[PDB]
């Protein structure tokens, strides 16, 4: 809940709060001031929402304190990296954070690729916000993945924010490690060797590795 005060107001929003209510009026379209540095470990799950706002901001934004977002579901910090890349906005992957170089909204790239969400509710809904002002209509693959936290998000986007949404089709186990067993002298190594040559893959004697690993 600290997102409103510690992110949006620095970004140029008029954030008014009471004890039990939060109202946010955003600044004129595409004039969001970038934030030089923000610690977001208290708002670990809200960095994706911050990232898309930074992508449309005036200047370079830097989010930190989100090491735990790598093994959360997908590599979320790298997900935002190369999904925003499709809008032509480069990010950088920091030790426990993400740097995002903002772009004027009118000259964003058209993500013809389509936005893959990694089946991550957070990723789908964050790019949902960006696609509100995009100069080109954005396709979001995996609509239904919002279900994890908010099934009716698309409903509310349509009902309250009056956003036109449309249905479209999605326009988009080999190489397993082989184990060889039996006993020494059986032709085990020769079969291994043959396979290595045939599949262009590395043979590894598990006895020899046990010797090298142990010393």
């Amino acid at each position: 809940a600290r997102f409103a005060v510690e992110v949006l107001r620095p970004m140029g929003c008029a954030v008014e709060q009471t004890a039990t209510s939060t109202t946010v009026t955003g600044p004129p379209i595409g004039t969001l001031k970038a934030i030089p540095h923000v610690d977001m470990e208290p708002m670990t799950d809200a960095f994706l929402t911050a990232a898309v706002l930074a992508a449309v901001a005036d200047g370079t934004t830097q989010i930190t304190g989100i090491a735990n977002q790598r093994v959360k579901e997908c590599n979320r910090i790298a997900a935002m990296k190369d999904q925003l890349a499709k809008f032509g906005v480069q990010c950088n992957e920091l030790e426990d954070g993400i740097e995002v170089i903002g772009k004027p909204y009118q000259e964003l790239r058209n993500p013809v690729e389509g936005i893959y969400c990694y089946d991550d509710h957070r990723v789908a809904m964050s790019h949902s916000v960006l696609s509100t002002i995009s100069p080109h209509p954005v396709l979001i693959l995996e609509r239904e993945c919002t279900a994890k936290t908010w099934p009716g998000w698309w409903d509310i986007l349509s009902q309250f924010f009056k956003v036109q949404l449309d249905g479209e089709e999605d326009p988009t186990g080999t190489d397993r490690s082989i184990f060889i067993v039996g006993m020494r002298g059986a032709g085990k190594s020769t079969a291994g060797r043959w396979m290595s040559e045939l599949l262009k893959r590395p043979l590894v004697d598990l006895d020899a590795e046990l010797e090298r690993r142990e010393g």
């Binding site: 190489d175 032709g187 079969a191 043959w194 396979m195 040559e197 045939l198 599949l199």
Partner: protein
């Protein structure tokens, strides 16, 4: 021979490796061809007719080892027959255990052996394996789970002619074969020429409904030669 280590990978073993590593395109290739065939061996021992194999395989896209027609059902014996055939034929193998109720020799009820024979096929890396839909569910599951890159031909034969193409009394078997097999094989009996028309019509309707699982559909008897 004994001198295996000094050699470089034989075609025999390469064909084997190609399949188990998921690199076989045996099904795509066959299905991309307008007409395809596999030759059904009726020989009691592959070693004793090893000279004949390559001739017999001409024009076919695979060789069917009819395990039931072999002179022995010992897993070790059958494993050799498969390896000998792979080496000699150098084409895909169809590993078929046909039960006697469905026109073969293998006993219907002898399941313990059937399972072991089925696994001998899978372990040997055969490109196709034919399990009958009449087999109990616990074996259909076990063979399906360990199938690997073997293509399953889900089969049913109707030698006593209890089923019908037009009436749709095949559907229950089709439905079953659909979830178990990569290829459906339904075989009935023709009494008259019309019975081939009904089959052809049936097959067409099934392929329309499930494009992704191709079908081998035949009528036995001289009447059903057209099928």
């Amino acid at each position: 021979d004994g001198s295996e280590a000094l050699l470089q990978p034989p075609a025999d073993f390469a064909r084997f490796v190609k399949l188990i590593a998921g690199q076989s395109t045996h099904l795509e290739d066959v299905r991309a061809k307008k007409h395809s065939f596999f030759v059904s061996l009726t020989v009691p021992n592959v070693a004793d007719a090893l000279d004949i194999i390559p001739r017999v395989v001409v024009g076919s896209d695979a060789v069917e080892l009819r395990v039931d027609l072999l002179e022995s059902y010992e897993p070790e014996f059958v494993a050799r027959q498969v390896a000998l055939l792979r080496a000699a034929a150098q084409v895909p193998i169809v590993y078929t255990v046909r039960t006697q109720s469905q026109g073969g020799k293998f006993p219907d009820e002898d399941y313990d052996l059937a399972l072991r024979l089925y696994q001998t096929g899978l372990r040997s890396g055969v490109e196709y394996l034919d399990l009958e839909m009449t087999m109990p569910d616990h074996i259909l599951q076990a063979v399906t789970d360990a199938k690997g890159f073997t293509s399953i031909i889900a089969s049913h034969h109707d030698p006593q002619c209890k089923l019908s193409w037009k009436s749709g009394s095949w559907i229950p078997f089709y439905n079953k074969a659909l979830q178990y097999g990569d290829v459906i094989k339904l075989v009935g009996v023709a009494r008259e020429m019309a019975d081939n028309f009904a089959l052809t019509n049936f097959k067409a309707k099934m392929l329309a409904a499930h494009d992704n699982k191709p079908m081998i559909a035949l009528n036995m008897g001289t009447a059903g030669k057209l099928s």
